[PDB]
Structure formats: structure tokens, C-alpha cells
Design a protein around this ligand. Structure first.
Ligand code: 9ZX
Lengths: 215, 215
């Protein structure tokens, strides 16, 4: 079947308009209806759009669904942004019994100034190595909003095996920190020329690389 | 409109059976298909039941959906309860005028065993020292329950400045992870013999120590 591709995050100040795209991988966006669901943090989801642009009763007309056949995409547009619009937004369609969801888009209504993350990539420590561990840590500090995406590369190939990322937490400077760790064996860590941590925040992606050496 | 009413919370111990009910307020439960979604906190949800009782590929056969017309309810029944089943569960049906979700049910799996944290201390990266920074990270993974206290030492004396610890977050092994980082100048780092990270969990302390390495 097809995928539905949503940006990981979006942000704006109160009173502004924000748009969340939902691109269909293969086939025609207009072949099947698209729904949008809102989840506020610590809340149950609710439908804000069904059948591309239908608004259920109780959902203000600040929320608007559209289809662009040229780009093969759905969009949810929210005008007059209010703090309660801060939530995760998922688009959803079908082909046959195949329900297809997007990955979700975290919408932040800016409570403070944007801050790009400090990203530090650490190669394995001597002590963990002699315990037969080559865990790498990617430390991500001092960012707002609190939404990041982390991907790892062995040389050039995406890694999915062994990646863990913490949920961003508010630190004493009122900015967010989190860590991504890749649990490698020594044999894996040494069997490559370099590893990489790619951090995406506010659509902007930074990339750090470490290589094996001996000191 | 109609509403789907779920319990707020249920608790049960491993290997036992738990049942979550989803009562339709008006209309017959069987007029429309019920879905069940599982959400681990900080994650996108996954479909665990569709069409009242159909399990997607990769959902364990311990998850069973049912309909009871007389009590106008849907139920999700989890057999052989495991710790990874700790999550929020949401039912969902159709209004033709809407997609409606229940308020969701937090499933607590009682009697999870203690797990001591795995602790890995990383000295400053080379590249970071070239950019005039000397952050140390202490990775704390695989611990239950999800509370730790971290103290840092410069040589043998307490470090009272530049320490941050992330809020522990449940990872895919259903154990917690967190990082403590110490923001030092290159000067502070080279002026000491060593720095230590001391992690206390359930009364047991684990201490790790790194030193400026020479090549
Ligand atoms: C992506 C996805 C899947 C597919 N998974 C992906 C990973 O591999 C297993 C299948 C999937 O099976 O189900 C998904 C359901 C999604 O959202 C449902 C919405 C209405 C909801 C439910 C509960 C709380 C908040 C929101 C969103 C995404 C999914």
C-alpha cells in the first residue's frame, strides 16, 4: 500500500495561521477521503476534519481541510491560533481494508522564543568497551519547541536497530533536553568508518559524526 | 452525536486477564465497527483491533475484541498480561456525522520488578573541545522504577554548578532512561584529575569516573 507523509512539527504565535501537509506516497489523494485527528497532551483524540473538509459539530471553522491534487496532498489549516490548539495532528486515509495513518505532526503555540538544539556526539567510553559495549550518546540540549526527530547512520545507511531517544524534558533554563543512544557492540562500532546522529528541529537538520580511533 | 464511555483506569498483575469496556451512549454498538488503539506515552498509537475483533499483523493474539449488544458495549480483553501492555487504550466508532473516540483507559501492570540502572559516563569529545566546550554525559538506562538521584564529583568534592538531569522516560524495553550532563569549560576539565557521576536508585549507588585521556 501507500504512506501518508506529515512534517514531524510546526509552530506559530497565538492569532497566526499554520498549515500541516499530508503527502500520499503512491496513487491519488482524491481516490480516498482524508480524516484529521487532534490529540492535546494528556487528552483523548477528537476528529477535527473528516471526508477531506467536513467539520464535526463543536469544531470551530478556524480548522479547515483541503486537498491539492497537483502535490497529491491533504492539508489542515488552523487560523487564529489559540494555546488549546497545541496538540498532535494525524491525517488518515485508505486503499481497501487498508487504513493508512500519517506519523503525526506536533503543533506548538510558541510560549517562548525558538532555540536551536546544542548537539554533542560522544564515541564509546573505554570502560563500556571492556564490558563489550560501544553505546554512542547524542546529547540534545537548550531547544524550544520541545519537539525533535533523531536518525542515526552507520556510514551512510540509516540504522533502526538499537536506537533509543528520551522524551524531551524542561531543564532549569526552561529549555528542553533529551538524549539518543545507539547500543552498538564493539564489532559493529569498529566494522564502520564513522557513525552519525541527525537531529531535526523546526524543519532544520544538524548532523554530527564520530569515527573509531585509539588515544 | 453519541459518546463512547471507557473506564479512566484499570490495574492488573502479569499473566492475568484484563477487560476494558467501551459503552455507546445512544445508538446500537453493532450499527458501526469498533477499533481499539494502544498508545505508549510519547509514542504514536498503533491499531490493536479493527472491525470489532480483527487483529492487524504484528499484534499479539493475547489481544481480543468483542461486542455485547445487551450492555450496548465493546470490550478489549488482554490475556497473559505482560509489562509491555502498559499503555493507554482508546476505542473508536463512527457517527456517519463523525469518528468518535472513548476518553481512553490507562492500563497499569502491577508488580513490575526492580531493575538497577546501567550507567555510562562519557568524557568530552575532541570536536567539542575544539569548539571550546567540555560537556560530560552520564547515560542512565534500563531502570525500574523510574526515579534516580545524580550527584557529580570534581576529584572527590561535590560539583554544585552546571548539572542537568533529564526526566526519566519509559523506553521500548518498558524500563526508564535519562541523561545527566555537566557543562564545563575546557579549563575546569583539564584542572581536575577526574570527574565522577554517582547514580542512586532504590538505595544502591553506582559511581563512574573519567579523566583527561593522553595519547
Ligand atoms: C502510524 C500508525 C499505525 C501503524 N503502525 C506504525 C508502526 O508499525 C506498526 C503499525 C497504526 O496502526 O495506527 C495508528 C493510529 C494513529 O492514530 C489513531 C488516532 C485517531 C489516535 C488514537 C489514539 C490516540 C491518539 C490518536 C496514528 C498512527 C498510526
Amino acid at each position: 500500500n501507500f504512506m501518508l507523509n506529515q512534517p514531524h512539527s510546526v509552530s506559530e504565535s497565538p492569532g497566526k495561521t499554520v498549515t500541516i501537509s499530508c503527502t500520499r506516497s503512491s496513487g491519488n489523494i482524491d481516490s480516498n477521503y482524508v480524516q484529521w485527528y487532534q490529540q492535546r497532551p494528556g487528552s483523548a483524540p477528537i476528529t477535527v476534519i473528516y471526508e477531506d473538509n467536513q467539520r464535526p459539530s463543536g469544531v470551530p471553522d478556524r480548522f479547515a481541510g483541503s486537498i491539492d491534487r497537483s502535490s497529491n496532498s491533504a492539508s489542515l489549516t488552523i487560523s487564529g491560533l489559540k494555546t488549546e490548539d497545541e496538540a498532535d495532528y494525524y491525517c488518515q486515509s485508505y486503499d481497501a481494508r487498508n487504513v493508512v495513518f500519517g506519523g503525526g505532526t506536533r503543533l506548538t503555540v510558541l510560549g517562548q522564543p525558538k532555540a536551536a538544539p546544542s548537539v554533542t556526539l560522544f564515541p564509546p567510553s573505554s570502560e563500556e568497551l571492556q564490558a563489550n559495549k560501544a553505546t554512542l550518546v547524542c546529547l540534545i540540549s537548550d531547544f524550544y519547541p520541545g519537539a525533535v526527530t533523531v536518525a542515526w547512520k552507520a556510514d551512510s545507511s540509516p540504522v533502526k536497530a538499537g536506537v533509543e531517544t528520551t522524551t524531551p524534558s524542561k531543564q532549569s533554563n526552561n529549555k528542553y533536553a533529551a538524549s539518543s543512544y545507539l547500543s552498538l557492540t564493539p564489532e559493529q562500532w569498529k566494522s564502520h568508518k564513522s557513525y552519525s546522529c541527525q537531529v531535526t528541529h523546526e524543519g532544520s537538520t544538524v548532523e554530527k559524526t564520530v569515527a573509531p580511533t585509539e588515544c
